[PDB]
Amino acid sequence: SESTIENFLCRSACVYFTEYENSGAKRYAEWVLTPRQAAQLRRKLEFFTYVRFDLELTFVITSTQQPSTTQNQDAQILTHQIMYVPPGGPVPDKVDSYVWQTSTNPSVFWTEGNAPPRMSIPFLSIGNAYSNFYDGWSEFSRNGVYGINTLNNMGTLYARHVNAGSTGPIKSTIRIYFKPKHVKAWIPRPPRLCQYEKAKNVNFQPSGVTTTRQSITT
Amino acid sequence: SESTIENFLCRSACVYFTEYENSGAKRYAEWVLTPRQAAQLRRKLEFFTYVRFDLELTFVITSTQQPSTTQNQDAQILTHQIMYVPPGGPVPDKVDSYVWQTSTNPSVFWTEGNAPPRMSIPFLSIGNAYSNFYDGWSEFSRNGVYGINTLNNMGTLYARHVNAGSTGPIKSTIRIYFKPKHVKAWIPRPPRLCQYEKAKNVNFQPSGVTTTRQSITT
Amino acid sequence: PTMNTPGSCQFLTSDDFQSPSAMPQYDVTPEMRIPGEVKNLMEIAEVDSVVPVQNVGEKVNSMEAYQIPVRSNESGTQVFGFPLQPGYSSVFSRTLLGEILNYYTHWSGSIKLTFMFCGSAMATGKFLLAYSPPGAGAPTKRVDAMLGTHVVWDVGLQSSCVLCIPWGGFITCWYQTNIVVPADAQSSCYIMCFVSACNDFSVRLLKDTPFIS
Amino acid sequence: PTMNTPGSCQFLTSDDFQSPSAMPQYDVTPEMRIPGEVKNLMEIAEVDSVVPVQNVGEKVNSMEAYQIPVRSNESGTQVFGFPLQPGYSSVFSRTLLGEILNYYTHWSGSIKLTFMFCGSAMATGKFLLAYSPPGAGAPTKRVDAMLGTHVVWDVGLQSSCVLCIPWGGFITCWYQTNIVVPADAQSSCYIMCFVSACNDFSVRLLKDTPFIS
């Protein structure tokens, strides 16, 4: 009654950490949506071969002041913009680019000091299910990477400060929460014995079957 | 009509006091959930041998500025995270540990200047009732503490500042409110005559039966 | 269109709202039947509890606080007496009925007392149990105690007497006759006194107990 | 007129609310039937998986961890034994039933074991499969193992034995008789052991796995 795949795969799990500054070398965040970065969620999803689900992206944006020597700093409420890029969408090369105005990318505006912004994404795969394990080459004629089918693409996420708050520097952080909804699974497979190495593939280092003991009769 | 166990055991009672600083030696709070610290509630609960109830945890988080000699301090809204650890859950060894991201511990995020955050906990005991008075040894083979059954465990609570507000130091406090809900009791027992000594056990110092008078006929 | 009235965004400690459950879709462990389920505090205040009537001096720090000494030699002499205020009086202070009362401010109901003569079977005598109503002070002589509400208790026949008190007043016991014993029987006996709530008993305005430190 | 209660404006991680869809009026691609649709984890824990019973030394880093050696020459001698705790015990650690259990805190249900003798057809003998209940320690001699719950397994007739265990206990195997083989047949054989959940099996309180690093 509790071990259903729903109650087993419907937990809000943080999947990203990054920072962007109102003024500075880094002024915007970018992260291609993937459930492979977080090992805790990756290992839970690698129980099944084919999986299909919806998302509920919920962000947590916090701002902290920086150690600067400018005086007479008067802060104004900060506004953050989070542009979701659909697969094949234009990606902002810079912070003040024109792509931040395309009516296709559904950006959500947020003003500091409110309930954290949340949006949902449907099943975007052209195929009929996201495939965790692919046993082929993405390119039709081959000469393409192994096990890298583009059917699982889920788009990219971009975030920036719409308005600089004060003359003094401000650095903000954003934590992206992943919540699969209406989950379905197919073809159960064995749990990953060895520890993960690269999020890109299934490469691993050989590991023993289990912890050893003194004698068989003990 | 008023003396029912519900109306007698359903009062919001503060049970904890602690402080954590944005920067400093103490940067996070921790308190194993127990109804034994507050004597006012402990003595009310020690009327009955077996008691079962739900909780309604409501916190009150207030922040005050500190006496520092840094200038040009510009504050940003503070966000506090309160991670509830279920029994047997991983416990953060430090403030910036990875355990603060486990999707199991249901942490509630809160931004200063809103209605204080509140969450509820069901009956978590594996047994069929929380037992106030145990007359045995927790360890099956003995050589274990007396009257310390682990069946009453209710988990731990952790709290921290997700984002430092300003360069200048900030110290926050948190008061945890305990509200038993849907209370049931069994086997009434006599009220504790002597004053409490250690929250760990029932050890006490011998006390007189009552206040004395001049003569029996007076 | 909504408008937020005053009283919004406040943590009024004594309020009953719906609360967001932290761990949902979690099983609860079905409850077994455990013998003896309290539903109301009153069921506890209906149990007789012995009273430290003789809380004189170092008696409180011994078991001899509960027994009332009744000697053979000495008529108008008085056995005991105490004011009938189960709340503030030191006699009914830590009694089961008294402790429960110390949790409330208002209360109305009858009080039942029960005396159990704990003496040798041969021992015989009579006692005058007189209850003076509130406005009047405690009686001084035996005659004055007789002329009010009284119960002449004969230990030789009945061994336990029950007094139901309405609506503080006073309770006084007098030696109607000295204890008479055949040879080889002790003449120094003792009396014990139980207290219990009776008939209607209500308690209003829950407050904190004053016995915590 | 509305009033905002406590618990408003908070991100309680474990809550189920309606969420504003980012891209509305977008088609979904109808789902085809794919063979084999898991609906409950239990259906996975009902599959027998081989057990590394002999996880001794460098056996874990080889295929010889799953086979139990049974020699011809040496009675009361013992084949194997391991404590019956599918959760914390190193034997049932990475088993399909064990891994699933490492995701939960409470669990109640029967455990089914199955031994498959992998020896030459001519090879014959008898084995004593004894299960000691929790409170008792593992037996020392063959007699003590016989006097409890036991199953005398004859390899000559039956090639696979099944043990259903209620409600940790111990499992011990003894050589009732040495292996008897006609000439031209090897006398050194092996035994394999599968584990599987049986009958009722429930799991409560989802937690994180301890095998991540």
Next chain:
Amino acid sequence: RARSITLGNSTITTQECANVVVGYGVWPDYLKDVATCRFYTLDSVQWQKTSPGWWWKLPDALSNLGLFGQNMQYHYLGRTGYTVHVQCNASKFHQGCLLVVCVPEAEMGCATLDNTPSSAELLGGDSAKEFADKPVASGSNKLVQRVVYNAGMGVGVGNLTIFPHQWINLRTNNSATIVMPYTNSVPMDNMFRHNNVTLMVIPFVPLDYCPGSTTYVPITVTIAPMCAEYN
């Protein structure tokens, strides 16, 4: 008049009007070994002019006694009701009162606030542990606080009648019979690891007699487990 009650092979002699007080309005029943249903008569304890009290732990009281001791040994967990009979035979020239009470989950305090007491000092096997009048010294000892006006649990001894009790007044009464249901949060529990009920006997009004009488009154305690089942 007298009457005989037979369970298995043992037999007890009691009056016609025994005045049984059921535990909590419930009679012991199986959860939803008959050979263990006998009258395990323990020893007698001499009640004297200065005796403070006594107390028994029912599971422990029957740990060494025959079938019950053998059963609770190999078997893991289980549950058991009880029917404690306290018989106190004294003359007509004696006088005194006793409070016979069965206290469930009676956790006892330790003389040293810092630590809990030891198992041997807490449990009296095949004998009855007794209270004391003066307070126990607070040193570096794992002793149990045996003050009688606190009973050890830490509560005023007077209001110990909330628990299923019964009073023996040597003026009218002579014995008490208390039926006790299985009270535990857990359906079945290891009898050796945890004791569910404690039998306490306290002499409120002291024994007294003229010179030339028996110097003591021999209280006698009989336990009979009702509806015992094991796993």
